Amino acid sequence: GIVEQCCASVCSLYQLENYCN
Amino acid sequence: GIVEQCCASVCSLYQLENYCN
Amino acid sequence: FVNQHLCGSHLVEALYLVCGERGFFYTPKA
Amino acid sequence: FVNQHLCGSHLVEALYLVCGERGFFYTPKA
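Structure tokens for the assembled complex are given below, as produced in the milestone run.
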């Protein structure tokens, strides 16, 4: 999930936007 | 929604917790 | 920190602290 | 600000700024 992708690894805009409503 | 209840008006724990997963 | 007007990042920050490992949803349009 | 390790409040803060009026969901267990 987001923690594995953005905290444990380097985040991206592409991935961040997957969590916008 | 949350803005009306917690930003435009005074928030509460009870209400805040309604938005926890 | 909760029993006040909370807007924008302030609101998001309160949700983060209260909800903890649960996480939360921030739906300002809904 | 996005292309780095973002944890906790830092992550929540990035979501807030990117997502804007859409809002977001923060699901750290999922």
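Residues 1-30 of chain C form one domain. Residues 24 and 30 of chain C are 14 Å apart (CA to CA). Further analysis is deferred to the final report.
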